[PDB]
From Swiss-Prot, chains A, B:
Keywords: Cytoplasm, Gluconeogenesis, Glycolysis, Isomerase. Its main location: cytoplasm. One of its GO terms (cellular component) is cytosol. PROSITE patterns: P_GLUCOSE_ISOMERASE_1, P_GLUCOSE_ISOMERASE_2, P_GLUCOSE_ISOMERASE_3. One of its GO terms (biological process) is glycolytic process. InterPro entries: G6P_Isomerase, G6P_Isomerase_C, Phosphoglucose_isomerase_CS, SIS_dom_sf, SIS_PGI_1, SIS_PGI_2. It catalyses: alpha-D-glucose 6-phosphate = beta-D-fructose 6-phosphate. This is Glucose-6-phosphate isomerase.
Amino acid sequence: GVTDSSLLNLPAWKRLQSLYEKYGNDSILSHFEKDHQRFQRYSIEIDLHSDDNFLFLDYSKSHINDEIKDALVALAEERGVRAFAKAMFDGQRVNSTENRAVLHVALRNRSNRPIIVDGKDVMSDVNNVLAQMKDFTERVRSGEWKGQTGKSIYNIVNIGIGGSDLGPVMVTEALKPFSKRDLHCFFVSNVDGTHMAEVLKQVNLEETIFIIASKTFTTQETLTNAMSARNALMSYLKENGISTDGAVAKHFVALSTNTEKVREFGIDTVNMFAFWDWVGGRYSVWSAIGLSVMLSIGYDNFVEFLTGAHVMDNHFASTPTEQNLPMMLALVGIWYNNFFGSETQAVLPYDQYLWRLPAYLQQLDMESNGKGVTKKSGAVAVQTGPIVFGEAGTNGQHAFYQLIHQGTKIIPCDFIGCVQTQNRVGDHHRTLMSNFFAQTEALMVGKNAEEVRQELVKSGMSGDAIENMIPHKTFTGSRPSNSILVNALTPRALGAIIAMYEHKVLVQGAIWGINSYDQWGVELGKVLAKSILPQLKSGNIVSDHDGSTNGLINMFNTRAH
Amino acid sequence: GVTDSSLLNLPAWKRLQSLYEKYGNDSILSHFEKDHQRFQRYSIEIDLHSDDNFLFLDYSKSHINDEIKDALVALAEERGVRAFAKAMFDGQRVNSTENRAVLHVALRNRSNRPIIVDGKDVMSDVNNVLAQMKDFTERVRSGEWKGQTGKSIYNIVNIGIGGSDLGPVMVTEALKPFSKRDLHCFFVSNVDGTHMAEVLKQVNLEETIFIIASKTFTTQETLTNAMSARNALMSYLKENGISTDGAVAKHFVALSTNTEKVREFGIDTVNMFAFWDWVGGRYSVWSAIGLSVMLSIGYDNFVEFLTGAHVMDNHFASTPTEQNLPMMLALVGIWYNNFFGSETQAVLPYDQYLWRLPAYLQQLDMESNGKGVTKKSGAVAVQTGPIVFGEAGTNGQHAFYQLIHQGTKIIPCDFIGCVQTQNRVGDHHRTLMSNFFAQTEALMVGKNAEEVRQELVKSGMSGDAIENMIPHKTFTGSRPSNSILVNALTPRALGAIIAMYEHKVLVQGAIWGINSYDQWGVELGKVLAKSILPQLKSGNIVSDHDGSTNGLINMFNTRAH
């Protein structure tokens, strides 16, 4: 088709326009002055079922009354969100354009509810691989696995790209306190072997395993980096006169399905960890792609991380939309992105260990829902995914806060925080949390002309210099925030925060009618680049592009080496 | 006042609305089909005056014809941009709300044009400090400066915050290839001494200097971290039975003006490097705040970095707006931010060394122009600063590109790149640049229904499965990009890229009529936090905030330790 019009003509969507048109300008503060229990009514707490841990969302600091909330839930129902999620959870082929299932929840399906794809239960496979990762990680971490010289392993360099790198990085970072301090992990992803050469002159090769992530195990990009590592290993044994016999098998493993191609590389296929087509890159940490994670925090902590996500999964499947945390999260987001016209979404985690989270979510959210067409194959009638940004609130806790407070863009803010701290050193945590609660307060209440006037008289300010200074120091308030709390950032807690955002992205994509699980958007750039490449040579002039690309390619060609 | 209306009623602004209304929807491609020299006409090259280095902006991939370009330049004239920049450059007090000068250009004023503030030429001071940093850095780097045990120095830990940390980090990262590989630099900024304790068990204290950045030298935040370092030094000498006499003076230096408070700390004031009120935090790397930089790349390379910025300064002061690179950069940005209604600005540097640049620019741009009122003390009538985001194009070179290509938000993209490479290893640079040029091409030209149809027939796709797959794989095109090229990323080149963005922010702020150089926006958050802090105690219930803040503070209080 040409253009959808479907969603644009739902009774629920029109009804939400009217409510935006009518109640849009009411202050966030006004909604609290009416109901003294607004906090409770506009928050959901999930029991995480271990150690008094929990995940809590307070979405009360928003421009949403009960009518608006009612309409948003109506929208989710009218659009079949719950039924779409059930199909996905059952292994139906909801990734319509690639005609495959989307089954990251199978990877953490602790109850082992049989999920049937192409006449087979995929849980034999999930569980088989998990048990294989268990046995392998146990032996690396205990020191029983020995390199070619007889030494235990102290380094893990993971070779991959994009999604197969960002999860493992974010998560092993997020959970350092649970990690074996002893063995260090590196994550190579860049095409030029700068990073690989960096890590090679840092690690003692006798003491290091390299994980090679590649489904086909041919991907020129990561196999080039793999080869550098392999060539260095062979080189290093050669010089120091050590047998190469069985060497690569002792220092390399694969995340792949291509049994014979891995075996050709010199890897032992007992150390090939499979994953499947229905694991999208941005949904893969939970699978064998997470092997460096499990090496780092061990098998039990990985199971906890998986369990966290599964508790999230059950919550999301079983709980009616008013009280369903990822649903509400998605709805308040749709409210800002689709009626307020907010192009962005900040994610501000007040825990230094989560410093990589916002980047992970950029991938997760923007690559899933950064789409221009519906499954039905019409052009979208409405805004889709927002631009995601953010940083950890420990450090700076100001850089761009100036603009969130006094600039002219309403930016939805997810503040994420923990009650408990992984160390009782002074009052560093309290000071941090005082800022955490204070930022969301400041955003909502602001500081009015009269408050500043009363404050500036007290400063003992000139009578005239005061009047023109007032506006500079005022704060509009009425700016939204979500406060997400966890008791403690444990494997299980992290797993639930990740799954929450995943189902948030699910919900939004279903409402907008897009395929959240394909990523066609990268193809053009690649095709044009393979074609530009032969043309980058000394003195070459090109004419087969537009004038800008031509002049750029041509400046490079005449000025290069 | 209440509301400005000034800018909204300029003949130049109204005229730009009409042109947007009329030509807005024309494809970027259409403007090239008319003029076969559009590339040249919509690009500016600055000679950097050394080594065939240059800085070039190609802003041709945009929705701008000649009329629109004429109108944008009219706007800059009608608003007195050039005259405002001249006042700033002359030491006038353009930071109206703080009633001070804004003179980061004095820090790099190589020609030593006298700049007169409060009856004194500030260049005696700039030059005096530069010469003091010269003598000090020369002695650290040569190994002549010895710690309390007689050993040369191999580590520099910089203790600061926010702006006094982000510049030094971005720049020393940007210029590793020019750095002394030998001595390693660390940058502590976080309130809890986690990072400080990390670096303390990493560095051999006998071999390390600590820089303490603080104008008053009392700031509880950084002086707390300073004290940890100082206490560890005293501890460490005590245990190993080494004299403490003169020890702190051998292992600590200050960036401050508070001579006696620094001296009390045990620092020798010959090693107090001053900077001034008219150096804003986000404009400070060029001053004594950049001491770790100069330690790292040495004095000559620092002068080159300064010179790069100064070449930029002269360009910007002397060249008429049509051909004035920072002016044009600011204008195409205003065009997207103020007529298209684009809330964002991506900065995508295709050089791994620049991976910290986008973060630096978030600070620089968002904290300067993330403002809600005019100097005149009216509320702004128009959108101000955009949300800045981005990452380095080496790694991933996809995460969020899906959305820039096929999502529903027009996002202005500054792609930044280099012709020459700091290493001739394989064809890694060409491959990289092929992507660099290809991404901007892909964005403009897109891929139409028929191109995909012709491509999918060739795939040998089913006749019916082809028709509904087409929209998924199409690319609208007509999405803007700026291609910024440099010959090589040297100190001088980096200095010019930073200054360019600084004057870009200058130009936008003058057009919108805001004070780009204050930052009042952080005060509210801090005041509310100092007040929330005494209330974080076990079992405490608060009632003096709104219900959300109350319930959050109260959940924390009942669930904490």
